[PDB]
Amino acid sequence: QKEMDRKGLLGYYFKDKDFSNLTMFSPTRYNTLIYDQQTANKLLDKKQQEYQSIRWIGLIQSNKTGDFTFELSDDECAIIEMDGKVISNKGKEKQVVHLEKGKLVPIKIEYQLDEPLNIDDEKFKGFKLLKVDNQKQLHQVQQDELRNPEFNKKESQEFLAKASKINLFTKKIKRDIDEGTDTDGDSIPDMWEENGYTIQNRIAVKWNDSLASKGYTKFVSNPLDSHTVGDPYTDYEKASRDLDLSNAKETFNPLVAAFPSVNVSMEKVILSPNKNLSNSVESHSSTNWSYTNTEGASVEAGIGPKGFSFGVSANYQHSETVAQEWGASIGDTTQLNTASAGYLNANVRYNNVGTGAIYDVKPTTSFVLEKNTIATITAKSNSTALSISPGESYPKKGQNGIAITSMDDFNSHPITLNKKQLDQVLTNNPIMLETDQTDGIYKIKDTHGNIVTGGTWNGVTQQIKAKTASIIVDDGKQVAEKRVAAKDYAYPEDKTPSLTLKDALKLSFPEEIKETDGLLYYNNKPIYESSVMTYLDGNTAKEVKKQINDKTGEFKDVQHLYAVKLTPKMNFTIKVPVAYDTAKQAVNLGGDNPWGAKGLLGTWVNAMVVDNSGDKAYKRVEPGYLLSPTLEFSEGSLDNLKKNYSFYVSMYVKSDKPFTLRINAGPYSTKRTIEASNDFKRVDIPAFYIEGFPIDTIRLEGSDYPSAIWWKDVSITEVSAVKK
Ligand SMILES: [Ca+2]
Ligand SMILES: [Ca+2]
Ligand SMILES: [Ca+2]
């Protein structure tokens, strides 16, 4: 789309004579009182661009100090209000107004026609605003003399809201909401915000299904709030893209907040017994973005009739908190294992894992090991403040991180660890990095349309949190956090549009998430509910169970986690699978009498895939005696599993008798007794990959003959590094 200035006025073009049925609104194009026809003609057939009333609204400044009267080119049907005063009324009652050069004052111009006029009529193209000086010398008011309303100012919202409820001709306040009313003064009529609108090159129209095929986005927003998600930008500034285009493109939707999230990660982590770092041990270190949300979580299962499950953290934290895990040593640890102190060095990297651009920030970071602070980065290490775009890092990806020993807080020294602490790091107790971003700023537009600093992110963080739910997606390589519009269903005057968790994933990940055959994929990997492991806080767990358990009211059709209607301060962490097996991509071995099934992870011995009218699942083979289905992992199928890591192996299962689910990894094997179910239910079993003890098989060991076992949607998701 065009990057447009805030010059000219904002034009409202109505079908009816009484400013009640708005057809389109747009800023006015250079030295005219009309709009861009190339864009308008794509949004609305030329034949429907015929209007019986027009309002132009915004600000005027004179290019010279003086005493002026005003007129429209067709003056007998125009009324002009300036600074709340009627200064011309159908060509009569002209007031002389003193205007100081460069001083913007509110202006509202209204025009009524006795029959509809097409925008392409001579008269429409001819409309101008004229300024008459003390000599009765006539001047067209120039584009640089005009500005749009200052959308983010309360006084401008009051001016727009008032203009939507009355007009200068009849002077009778509207008794009820119509298709012109703009209660919150964000420029977009209440009924458009509820029922749908689109904007292209700052031309806004009501939604029509003919706009879907042309690829336009249907926006909805809260008609009672100029900032539906509480971020620095109005609903209109977001939908119109009239904001810092460094913000992520998902934020050009009123229902997705612009919100930075700055964290710090560590790379090239070493330990030495020597202060000078000679004879350092290197590491297979890992960053665990969502550690506190997963490690030690409790699993709640058997949720609703579809029997889904989720994890619950007692220590839920957002994406500014990161865990650093040593992973494993590289090199001779003989010396380090006898030492009374160790010395840690690393490179650090700042990551903006949110959707909002942040400028001039000097983040503070604590480094905490088993509740003890071992280091702090203060403003002192970033005398040159940072500016980081969403999804980017400083230093940028492909550049080395910053050595801790080079940063001013560290005085050219590594991090000292006492003997106990050195053992804690080597045994995969995490170093927690918690980062704060309280001086970082965002950019806005001032009354003349200039880019200025708008304020600190700290100043908008409360309102964003109060109006949104948080979604964190962690694929074990990077993390991303989104804040999306949420609704309090207990408060009917909260007119925020309803959004599900699935709808929110689609809106907030426009590049990474696609929907294929009704299921979401994240960078071509599964992110559908049966494939992922989702972690909640206690509040969110209670809210989800309430919606599932409601069979009759607002939530009667909520039966799955991804169908949950978002409520304020809900928190979700989604772990994307590192391996998965779907019966939809499996083939039977043995032709007419199958004995096994080959899928994405390997061969299920003593299983076959069954198609029931398009619905595929695995079933245990039934030759007349008990067998145990056994997944023989193929060479390479578990190459994505981190060493010295814990996981969940999850699947949906149904059996008429109990069975034992076994993960064989030698001395690190796990097992669970699974109760009989009438319906598929999700089961989640912990699994361990300890270096030297690969995961060899999954086995479903039955109890009882005769019986049946069916399963589908096997997934493996990361938890965290295994403590030694
Ligand atoms: Ca509005
Ligand atoms: Ca609004
Ligand atoms: Ca329900």
Q: What is the DSSP letter of 406?
A: G
Looking from the CA of 9 toward its CB, the CA atoms found within 13 Å total 27
- Pairwise CA distance, residues 497 & 193, whole Å: 9
Count each helix (H run) and each strand (E run) in the chain, helices first.
11, 51
237 alpha carbon – ligand 2 mean position (Å): 11
- Closest ligand (CA of 226): 2
Torsion angle, alpha carbons of 384, 389, 392, 393, to 10: 10
151 alpha carbon – ligand 2 mean position (Å): 11
- Closest ligand (CA of 183): 1
Phi, psi of 657 (to 5 degrees): -135, 160
Amino acid at 628: S
- 632 CB contacts (<8 Å, ≥6 apart)? 602, 603, 604, 605, 696, 697
Tell the burial category of 445 from Cβ atoms under 10 Å away from its Cβ (0-12, 13-18, 19+).
buried
Looking from the CA of 265 toward its CB, the CA atoms found within 13 Å total 28
- Tokens 């003959």 sit on residue: 705
531 alpha carbon – ligand 2 mean position (Å): 36
> How far are the Cα atoms of 264, 317, 368, 540, 696 from residue 321, in angstroms, in the given order?
8, 6, 11, 19, 34
- Closest ligand (CA of 548): 3
The strand pairing partners of 710, in sequence order, are 619, 654
- Tokens 């003919």 sit on residue: 210
**Residue 186: which of 143, 146, 226 has the closest Cα?**
226
146 alpha carbon – ligand 1 mean position (Å): 22
Tell how far CA 145 is from the center of its chain: 39
- Pairwise CA distance, residues 185 & 174, whole Å: 15
Q: Which long-range contacts (CB under 8 A, 24 or more apart) does 554-559 make?
A: 554/489, 555/489, 559/304, 559/305, 559/306
189 alpha carbon – ligand 2 mean position (Å): 8
Tell the burial category of 552 from Cβ atoms under 10 Å away from its Cβ (0-12, 13-18, 19+).
exposed
Radius of gyration for the chain, computed over Cα atoms and rounded to the nearest angstrom: 32
Spell out the domains of the chain, with CATH numbers in brackets.
Answer: 10-219 (3.90.182.10), 262-285+326-436 (2.60.120.240), 461-578 (3.10.20.110), 580-721 (2.60.120.260)
3-state secondary structure at position 124: helix
530: left (phi over 0), alpha (psi -120 to 50) or beta: alpha
Tell the burial category of 449 from Cβ atoms under 10 Å away from its Cβ (0-12, 13-18, 19+).
middle
Joined together, the tokens standing for residue 526 give: 């599964």
Q: Obtained via which technique?
A: X-ray
Q: What is the DSSP letter of 409?
A: G
461: left (phi over 0), alpha (psi -120 to 50) or beta: alpha
CB-proximal residues (5 Å) to ion ligand 1: 182, 184, 186, 188
56 alpha carbon – ligand 1 mean position (Å): 17
**Residue 235: which of 496, 570, 39, 438 has the closest Cα?**
496
220 alpha carbon – ligand 2 mean position (Å): 9
For the chain, the farthest-separated pair of C-alpha atoms sits apart, in whole angstroms, at 109
- Helix, strand and coil content of the chain, in percent to the nearest 5, comes to 15, 40, 45
> How far are the Cα atoms of 142, 188, 198, 272 from residue 180, in angstroms, in the given order?
28, 9, 16, 71
- Pairwise CA distance, residues 376 & 366, whole Å: 5
462 alpha carbon – ligand 2 mean position (Å): 18
| Sequence-ordered alpha helix ranges (H) in 74-215 | 122-126, 154-165, 190-195, 210-213
639 alpha carbon – ligand 3 mean position (Å): 39
516 alpha carbon – ligand 3 mean position (Å): 25
Give exposure, 172-197, as e/b (b: 16+ Cβ within 10 Å).
eeeeebbbbbbbbbbbbbbbbbeebb
3-state secondary structure at position 624: coil
230 alpha carbon – ligand 3 mean position (Å): 29
Phi, psi of 589 (to 5 degrees): -110, 130
Tell the burial category of 70 from Cβ atoms under 10 Å away from its Cβ (0-12, 13-18, 19+).
buried
The strand pairing partners of 286, in sequence order, are 325
> How far are the Cα atoms of 60, 104, 139, 318 from residue 101, in angstroms, in the given order?
10, 9, 15, 50
Tell the burial category of 299 from Cβ atoms under 10 Å away from its Cβ (0-12, 13-18, 19+).
middle
- Pairwise CA distance, residues 345 & 490, whole Å: 52
Joined together, the tokens standing for residue 170 give: 């009849």
CB–CB of 333/426 below 8 Å?
A: yes
Amino acid at 143: Q
- Pairwise CA distance, residues 587 & 601, whole Å: 12
3-state secondary structure at position 268: strand
Tell how far CA 119 is from the center of its chain: 39
